[PDB]
Amino acid sequence: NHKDWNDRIAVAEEMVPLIGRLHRNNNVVVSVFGRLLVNVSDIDIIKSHRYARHIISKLPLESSLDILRELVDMNLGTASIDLGQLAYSFEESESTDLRAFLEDALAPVIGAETDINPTDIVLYGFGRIGRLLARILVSREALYDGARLRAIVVRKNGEEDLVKRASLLRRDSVHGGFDGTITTDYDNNIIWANGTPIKVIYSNDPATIDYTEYGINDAVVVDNTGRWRDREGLSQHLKSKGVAKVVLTAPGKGDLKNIVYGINHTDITADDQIVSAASCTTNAITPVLKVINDRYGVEFGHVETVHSFTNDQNLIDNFHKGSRRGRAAGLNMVLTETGAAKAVSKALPELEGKLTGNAIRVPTPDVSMAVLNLTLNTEVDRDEVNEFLRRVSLHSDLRQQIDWIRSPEVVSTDFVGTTHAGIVDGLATIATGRHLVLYVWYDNEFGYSNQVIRIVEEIAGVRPRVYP
Amino acid sequence: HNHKDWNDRIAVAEEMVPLIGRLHRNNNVVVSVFGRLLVNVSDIDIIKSHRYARHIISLPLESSLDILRELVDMNLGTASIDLGQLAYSFEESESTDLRAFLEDALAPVIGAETDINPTDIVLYGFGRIGRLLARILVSREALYDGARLRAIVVRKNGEEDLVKRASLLRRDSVHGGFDGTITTDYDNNIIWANGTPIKVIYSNDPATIDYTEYGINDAVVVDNTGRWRDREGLSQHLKSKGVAKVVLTAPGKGDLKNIVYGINHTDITADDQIVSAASCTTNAITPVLKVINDRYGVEFGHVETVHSFTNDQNLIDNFHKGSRRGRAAGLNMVLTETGAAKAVSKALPELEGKLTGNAIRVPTPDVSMAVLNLTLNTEVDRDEVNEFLRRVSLHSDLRQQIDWIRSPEVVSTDFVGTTHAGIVDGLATIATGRHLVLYVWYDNEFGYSNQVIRIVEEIAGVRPRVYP
Amino acid sequence: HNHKDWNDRIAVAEEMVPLIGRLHRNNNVVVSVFGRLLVNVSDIDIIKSHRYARHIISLPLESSLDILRELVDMNLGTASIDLGQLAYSFEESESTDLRAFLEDALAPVIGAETDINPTDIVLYGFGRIGRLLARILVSREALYDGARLRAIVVRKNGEEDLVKRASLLRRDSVHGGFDGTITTDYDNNIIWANGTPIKVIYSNDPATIDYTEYGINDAVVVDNTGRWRDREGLSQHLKSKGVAKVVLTAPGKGDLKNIVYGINHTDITADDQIVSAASCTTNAITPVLKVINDRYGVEFGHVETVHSFTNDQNLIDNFHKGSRRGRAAGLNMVLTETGAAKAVSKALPELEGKLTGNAIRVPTPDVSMAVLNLTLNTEVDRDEVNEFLRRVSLHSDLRQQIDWIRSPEVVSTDFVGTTHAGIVDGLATIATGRHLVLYVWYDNEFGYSNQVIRIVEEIAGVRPRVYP
Amino acid sequence: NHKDWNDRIAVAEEMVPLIGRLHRNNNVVVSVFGRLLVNVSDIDIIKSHRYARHIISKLPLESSLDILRELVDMNLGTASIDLGQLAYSFEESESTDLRAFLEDALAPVIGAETDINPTDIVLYGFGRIGRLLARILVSREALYDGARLRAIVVRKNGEEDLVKRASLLRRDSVHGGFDGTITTDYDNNIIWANGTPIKVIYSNDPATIDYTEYGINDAVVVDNTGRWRDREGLSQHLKSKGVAKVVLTAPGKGDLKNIVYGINHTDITADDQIVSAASCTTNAITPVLKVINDRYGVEFGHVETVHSFTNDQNLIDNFHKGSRRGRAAGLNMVLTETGAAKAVSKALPELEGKLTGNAIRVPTPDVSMAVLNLTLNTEVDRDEVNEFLRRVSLHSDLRQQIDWIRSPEVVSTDFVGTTHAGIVDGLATIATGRHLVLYVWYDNEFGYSNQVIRIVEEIAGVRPRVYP
Ligand SMILES: NC(=O)c1ccc[n+]([C@@H]2O[C@H](COP(=O)([O-])OP(=O)(O)OC[C@H]3O[C@@H](n4cnc5c(N)ncnc54)[C@H](OP(=O)(O)O)[C@@H]3O)[C@@H](O)[C@H]2O)c1
Ligand SMILES: NC(=O)c1ccc[n+]([C@@H]2O[C@H](COP(=O)([O-])OP(=O)(O)OC[C@H]3O[C@@H](n4cnc5c(N)ncnc54)[C@H](OP(=O)(O)O)[C@@H]3O)[C@@H](O)[C@H]2O)c1
Ligand SMILES: NC(=O)c1ccc[n+]([C@@H]2O[C@H](COP(=O)([O-])OP(=O)(O)OC[C@H]3O[C@@H](n4cnc5c(N)ncnc54)[C@H](OP(=O)(O)O)[C@@H]3O)[C@@H](O)[C@H]2O)c1
Numbered sequence A, D: 001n002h003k004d005w006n007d008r009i010a011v012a013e014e015m016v017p018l019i020g021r022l023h024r025n026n027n028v029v030v031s032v033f034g035r036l037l038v039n040v041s042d043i044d045i046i047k048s049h050r051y052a053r054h055i056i057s058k059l060p061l062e063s064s065l066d067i068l069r070e071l072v073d074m075n076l077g078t079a080s081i082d083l084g085q086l087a088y089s090f091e092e093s094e095s096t097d098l099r100a101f102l103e104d105a106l107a108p109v110i111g112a113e114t115d116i117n118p119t120d121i122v123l124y125g126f127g128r129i130g131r132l133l134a135r136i137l138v139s140r141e142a143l144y145d146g147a148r149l150r151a152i153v154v155r156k157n158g159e160e161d162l163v164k165r166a167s168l169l170r171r172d173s174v175h176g177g178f179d180g181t182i183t184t185d186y187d188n189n190i191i192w193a194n195g196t197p198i199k200v201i202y203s204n205d206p207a208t209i210d211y212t213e214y215g216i217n218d219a220v221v222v223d224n225t226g227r228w229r230d231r232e233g234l235s236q237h238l239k240s241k242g243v244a245k246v247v248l249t250a251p252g253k254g255d256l257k258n259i260v261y262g263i264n265h266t267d268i269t270a271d272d273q274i275v276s277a278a279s280c281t282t283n284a285i286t287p288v289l290k291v292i293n294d295r296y297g298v299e300f301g302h303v304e305t306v307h308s309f310t311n312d313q314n315l316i317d318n319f320h321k322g323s324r325r326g327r328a329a330g331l332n333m334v335l336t337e338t339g340a341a342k343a344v345s346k347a348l349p350e351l352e353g354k355l356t357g358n359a360i361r362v363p364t365p366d367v368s369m370a371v372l373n374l375t376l377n378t379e380v381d382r383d384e385v386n387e388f389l390r391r392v393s394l395h396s397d398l399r400q401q402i403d404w405i406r407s408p409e410v411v412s413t414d415f416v417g418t419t420h421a422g423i424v425d426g427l428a429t430i431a432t433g434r435h436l437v438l439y440v441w442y443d444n445e446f447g448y449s450n451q452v453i454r455i456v457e458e459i460a461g462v463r464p465r466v467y468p
Numbered sequence B, C: 001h002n003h004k005d006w007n008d009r010i011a012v013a014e015e016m017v018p019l020i021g022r023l024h025r026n027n028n029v030v031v032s033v034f035g036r037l038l039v040n041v042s043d044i045d046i047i048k049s050h051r052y053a054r055h056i057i058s059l060p061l062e063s064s065l066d067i068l069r070e071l072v073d074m075n076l077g078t079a080s081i082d083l084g085q086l087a088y089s090f091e092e093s094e095s096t097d098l099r100a101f102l103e104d105a106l107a108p109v110i111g112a113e114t115d116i117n118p119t120d121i122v123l124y125g126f127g128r129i130g131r132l133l134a135r136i137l138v139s140r141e142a143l144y145d146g147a148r149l150r151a152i153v154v155r156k157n158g159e160e161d162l163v164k165r166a167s168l169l170r171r172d173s174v175h176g177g178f179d180g181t182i183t184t185d186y187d188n189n190i191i192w193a194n195g196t197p198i199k200v201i202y203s204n205d206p207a208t209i210d211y212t213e214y215g216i217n218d219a220v221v222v223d224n225t226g227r228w229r230d231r232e233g234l235s236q237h238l239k240s241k242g243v244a245k246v247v248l249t250a251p252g253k254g255d256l257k258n259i260v261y262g263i264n265h266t267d268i269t270a271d272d273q274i275v276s277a278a279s280c281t282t283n284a285i286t287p288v289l290k291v292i293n294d295r296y297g298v299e300f301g302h303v304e305t306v307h308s309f310t311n312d313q314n315l316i317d318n319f320h321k322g323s324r325r326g327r328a329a330g331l332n333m334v335l336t337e338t339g340a341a342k343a344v345s346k347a348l349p350e351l352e353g354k355l356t357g358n359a360i361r362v363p364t365p366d367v368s369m370a371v372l373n374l375t376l377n378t379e380v381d382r383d384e385v386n387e388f389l390r391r392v393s394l395h396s397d398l399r400q401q402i403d404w405i406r407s408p409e410v411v412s413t414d415f416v417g418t419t420h421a422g423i424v425d426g427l428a429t430i431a432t433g434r435h436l437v438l439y440v441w442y443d444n445e446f447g448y449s450n451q452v453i454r455i456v457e458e459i460a461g462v463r464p465r466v467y468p
Helices: A005-026 A042-054 A061-069 A085-091 A098-105 A128-143 A161-170 A280-295 A340-347 A382-395 A446-460 B006-027 B043-051 B061-071 B083-091 B128-143 B161-170 B280-295 B340-347 B382-395 B446-460 C006-027 C043-051 C061-071 C083-091 C128-143 C161-170 C280-295 C340-347 C382-395 C446-460 D005-026 D042-054 D061-069 D085-091 D098-105 D128-143 D161-170 D280-295 D340-347 D382-395 D446-460
Strands: A028-032 A079-082 A119-124 A147-154 A182-185 A190-193 A196-202 A219-223 A243-248 A274-276 A298-308 A334-336 A355-362 A368-376 A402-405 A422-425 A430-432 A435-442 B029-032 B079-082 B119-124 B147-154 B182-185 B190-193 B196-202 B219-223 B243-248 B274-276 B298-307 B334-336 B355-361 B368-376 B402-405 B422-425 B430-432 B435-442 C029-032 C079-082 C119-124 C147-154 C182-185 C190-193 C196-202 C219-223 C243-248 C274-276 C298-307 C334-336 C355-361 C368-376 C402-405 C422-425 C430-432 C435-442 D028-032 D079-082 D119-124 D147-154 D182-185 D190-193 D196-202 D219-223 D243-248 D274-276 D298-308 D334-336 D355-362 D368-376 D402-405 D422-425 D430-432 D435-442
Touching (some): A005 A028, A005 A042, A005 A061, A005 B006, A028 A042, A042 A061, A061 A085, A061 A098, A079 A085, A119 A446, A128 A161, A128 A196, A128 A446, A147 A446, A161 A182, A161 A190, A219 A446, A243 A446, A280 A298, A280 A382, A280 A402, A280 A422, A280 A435, A280 A446, A298 C368, A298 C435, A355 C435, A368 C368, A382 A402, A382 A430, A435 C298, A435 C355, B006 B061, B043 B061, B061 B083, B079 B083, B119 B128, B119 B446, B128 B147, B128 B446, B147 B446, B161 B182, B161 B190, B161 B196, B219 B446, B243 B446, B280 B368, B280 B422, B298 B340, B340 B355, B368 D355, B368 D368, B382 B430, B430 D355, B435 D355, C006 C061, C006 D005, C029 C083, C079 C083, C119 C128, C119 C446, C128 C147, C128 C161, C128 C196, C128 C446, C147 C446, C280 C298, C280 C382, C280 C446, C298 C340, C340 C355, C382 C430, D005 D042, D005 D061, D028 D042, D042 D061, D061 D085, D079 D085, D085 D098, D119 D446, D128 D161, D128 D446, D147 D161, D147 D219, D147 D446, D161 D182, D161 D190, D219 D446, D280 D298, D280 D382, D280 D422, D280 D446, D340 D355, D382 D430
Parallel strands (some): A028 A079, A119 A147, A119 A219, A219 A243, A298 A355, A402 A422, B119 B147, B119 B219, B219 B243, B298 B355, C029 C079, C147 C196, C298 C355, D028 D079, D119 D219, D219 D243, D243 D274, D298 D355
Antiparallel strands (some): A182 A190, A190 A196, A334 A355, A368 A435, A430 A435, B190 B196, B334 B355, B430 B435, C190 C196, C334 C355, C368 C435, C422 C435, D182 D190, D334 D355, D368 D435, D430 D435
């Protein structure tokens, strides 16, 4: 029941000023477990406070209100503060006064520096992944001000260019409208998105740009074009003045590291100039396969993905590079080569030779569904596997790469806009002797984009740290 | 233009939020800027929403923030105050004091009834129209608390009905998620939607329900079944104890008033028990035609409505009322009959015998387009007609019904969720001689449902009163 | 290869046509080449159809044309003669005379009953399955004249029913036009379909029809309503005078035999009054699984069926039996429950407890794909499994149920109209160790309907007899 | 009724040998009004004989059988002989013997030459129009042997090229399977389609091909690429050795003639080296507008086309040259610039300045619908306009460019594969004072393709002549 709804609103209204003071004065983003309370409607704060059951026992707004009331005068510097962890492991201390507990558990923060130098991001390409990257980058510059989108690079076409590019960022048939205002300065070739000025750079050669011409230096280029997937090709960006590092939103060929965030971002070194974020399916299934292989062992795995179509395919039957992709995407079920076996082996080198996979592309514009047919080296029960994945999903350090649900009503549309790389549908799970079958949802556009943003911030050094 | 000043703009908005929130709680006042609310919206919409005030007068946030701090002290009643109207006719006036002006432009309210009695709404049916009526009734209850959704009536199917119907309100392939929480209480057969308890009532006969059992009386029933379109049928509802009035979401047959809100809602009298809201197409074009007819003249007019499919139709060819309407809705363009021309002429009898039209149904799930080919009694040029409709849509008494837009690249999905009954695509207007072509978009589901909600509020006597 | 000889090939075929046509008229003989008819087909199909005889033995047209001229003189009866079987085991024999061979391979027929008594078929319902049953019954009446469609039964809607239902049989968004003419006789409530008069009978109660009124007796009813899936319900039909047997186009509940033709149709006895044809998915995969299970062994098996939507579902989210099944069928990928695994195990009880599966519904209107993940009791290689299924599909007793194909670029629309219950995509087969992945296409509407037509012909005693 | 069906079949079976003798011996294609009886099932011959009511009073097969029985020994040379016109205006002579009448009315033909030298056709491009052109060309080489498809030109890609190109001709998601067999000779880069060997030529420069290298000379290049629409560009083909003439399947810019067959093909001269077939909509509406403007006079016309999407558009929102075309075609109604006003003025120079037009692109893969809003210079009645268009459609020399129907059941799917440029839906027609509104269907892929084939045969000199 919700007979208490209006009080819940009323406490959250008390919370907003406090939340926003810590933001503007102390650069402190307040969260409740995974979920932000910053730049957010009162009703969202309610919804997110309900959510805390799904990790803890029972979370009332007052405990948040009281930690916030005692955080306003604690002279804090920048940091992400989880209001919920502070509630739980205060109650499990256990002794008031609250203040005392906070000053202790938020020690490194108190009095720390409230500014960090941001890092310039350039999007090379501005397509489906490119633009969702730009949305996220603009949201997070407003939360954290760590990575600044400064520019996009597109080829010169036909001089209404700029208006269409801004419109493609303002609007999306699938992802709906941009959270903010998008204005265009035609004279200086800039798209303004909220606070952020995005220079549009016209070029046919990734190697002959002087980014310093636009006040860009030391930039991470996120190439979302996919025209170059080998080191020799991606190396073109490093010839452009202003470029420190390159992230490919696609499987990199040869020696290029393929990085699945949460799983092998610790193998990114200071010296790695060129890195790749793998594919959407790779990011969807690799957390899961790694976690299952370490616990139970995977003799063999097949992946079938029932996948949304992408923009390389054709509205109507016509020629195409790949397998059967050139048949009309919106009228057909299409059997397609996935590279996901090979990709999963790159990042988990221990499953080399043990995996096969295949795609079926169907008439939807976003969101996909991996089916993992897994032969284990141990006998397993269904509820034990569900509970161990729910645990990883909700409390492990792959918390943000993996979600777990037991919703009997959700379908592909409901996953549009999810921030996880992979969402295990728990009701579906099958286990029988050594056989496991897992079903994984992913928003292949946005879910993947979020992984790429995380790679970009590790590389830039501006991942926020969460206390405690 | 630019957004060099965006972080400045956020700052102010945020000093507004606690003050907008006082008024709403303490004084039951909703605050707007030329018809855009600032209650239960982000800081970003407050920025957007003061920005679009250049369309109207030709507005700094401080003018609002200066206004607001006068209204926390003023012993105010229940009102929809506009900050925009209040600033314009302060400048273009003899000016200071501020306090003095806001206590004379706002005499009617200062110390008044802060609470009207709400009126109980029953939703008979709970499909595509009914569930959006629910979403609006719920969020307008938070804003104004005039009309309260009390109950839906459906037929008993299984024993898992209640939870399936809660799901249907919580998620939607087109309209996305409910803004709030939906909880189900099985013991009492209640869907909670934010603070709103919605009784589920199960009945095969609209005539044999004592609504007073469930605490409901003098209710308006919004029959969104489509089952009964004549007086006899809809009179069934009046036989049920607790029912005062009936609103049909559809063209009423025979002698039933068909109401297009903004145009002829004043034809509703206190003894009118049963009212009709006409079709989506009628609501979308009647305003535009009347405005065009009053200003230039209409000699002749053709309507082609290019229209989304509706749920009565068929995924794959099968039986239906009409031969063409039952063929695979998602695989065909379907030329079909429209009642619009005859229905437009009911409401505008001055156009009786001057109008024709057809409908073509296409594989989209929501949003339609009316193409209006008008021979006029007068010569027009494209830029002049545009500016006329732009003025009509900003200043006229049909603001809420008519919007006009200049935006490029816009397509049908961008109009999901729009509040206006019809939106004139400025870029598409064609005008040569006495010949005019207008393109009018409409969210046949949500746009139309907002018009239904205005009739309901009108019948019930709770149209918010907007001052001054 | 080439077609340097194509105009030569047409020439011969055309000297066949008048002779194939004699046999059919005079002697009630249908002529085929390894299971492909040459009656009421183009000259081009006769070329195609002698060409695909290299798949089987490893065939000149003259061998056929030489055969034919012997059969115009031979006082022949009613038979489905194969020209292919007759040529192969003439060469690989002691050969001339030709006349002598064809009067000893074809002793059973030479001078026999040229006319069997047909059996009256009633179609109860007339939707997606029923109308394709009609198309098959009509064109098989021209070929064999064993089962005759006599009547459909529908509920009275309007007074333009008859013509709407004639239209539904004449046109189809997926299956294209009826091959023939459909005429309506309103006075007698008859749809003419080529030479076939189909009575339309209107009834709310399957139990209260004297079919003998309309000249129908000892009929098989093919209940394609879906309404009644148990013995009690389907027994209603037997209470109607004129009814002998009932065939349900669906999995029958309880104790009703579920029949997969090619596999267990011999379980039908003369005292079986009510029979079930199982689901599309069951018909598509049961044959393949049994063949794979007999040859290698099945230790474990998972089925994912990627499946077209069906007409019970919803264009746009609304109520349904299942929560997920009622969401917008054309906008979503929908993970849902399948009965297939349990139904496969009914028919193959040797696989009881070794099978699992799920279904995903996608926005296509017809044609589905079963993905079979099989752990086998034996090691297999891709090329060997392929050649096995290829042999099974050409030579085995499940030829009509199983096809195998090597063709590139094939996608779901190319399988509309296919006669086989399931078609193995050769290119997609994956095999490594004991692990096998098979992809089986099926026209869930037309393929399945052909299996229904085989049960019907079997129950009725009119399976064409194919010699020698 | 069809109680006489089997006799109808039986007479047509007598007809087939005769039809085919005249074909193979005399190169004589027999037709009944518009419809061929050659390479066609018996049931088609029936259907086409029914059709003759729709032009005449009552047509029985026997009159066809008897004209054919007396045509077999009349020593005829090549010609198209309409069996129906010969039936009508024999009965309206009137005197037997039949023979005498034929030898007189088929005078020019008797004893004439039975061979004509064919013309080599090259398809530059092999996309949606290209391949339908290839289907038609292969059908008509088998009927008339006037234009021979010899080659396609595609750019060099990635070496599975040839198999995909053959597969794209074999199969089509919308147009279904090819009528014949398609084999590939990989060694000589040939696609065999039935009798016809198609050389695949790989080139990046239309100007540097020696077509004589492949035994091609004096060829009409049908450029269906649309990369070059100006004379300077199309002139590139004339530099290639082997090229006589060029036909652009698109509006040609500048001085290039835009040819709508039936309407201005008489303006093609012996000296015109480069000609264009206009657009699909232009071909759909120009017959109609010309015919209406000559009778009644067109003050002003607007065209709205509700148009299928084409392959230049995007599955999902992305950048694009044109207006709003880059939004996702399968999810949206999209307002688009048509050039059809300008195009219709080119071919009808008399409507210059009097026409506007617009497209709405909707989620269908083929078939479109023009709505013509016409202000006339005369008052008109509805039935008189319907009857005058039905007359033009069925008996004028634009018979094949225009059809007329009064079918209450047909929708866009039913027009796939129509051979007319434009099909007027007569039930829809509106007329009121000086205002006419006409609705025109067209299969924008195939309908247009057929017009282009006709242009190709006029230019080649191999249009067949029909007697009488
Ligand atoms: N664009 C639009 O959709 C649009 C716009 C304007 C007006 N309209 C009109 O609004 C009406 C509702 O349309 P809709 O699209 O919302 O239809 P819908 O989605 O089919 O919803 C209709 C609702 O009414 C219920 N219902 C139907 N027949 C009933 C009966 N005999 N007894 C009780 N309940 C019954 C349904 O029951 P279940 O939930 O059990 O199926 C469902 O809840 C129609 O008259 C339509 O013409 C529609
Ligand atoms: N892929 C497939 O479609 C497929 C394959 C295998 C088996 N099945 C099964 O075959 C059955 C038929 O499915 P379908 O897709 O053909 O359904 P459909 O297209 O809805 O056709 C069902 C037909 O039965 C009629 N009907 C329904 N309820 C009735 C009732 N109470 N009394 C009398 N007639 C009634 C309908 O009447 P109206 O014409 O008046 O609407 C319609 O003629 C279902 O059980 C389904 O599970 C379907
Ligand atoms: N409704 C219709 O589709 C329709 C109707 C009437 C007229 N038209 C016009 O007909 C033309 C063809 O349209 P379509 O729908 O057939 O387009 P399409 O399906 O894209 O076919 C284009 C063909 O031309 C080739 N091509 C494209 N650019 C080329 C280049 N620079 N050099 C060489 N070859 C090139 C393509 O090569 P690949 O195969 O390698 O991709 C393909 O074979 C267009 O101008 C269009 O406006 C279309």
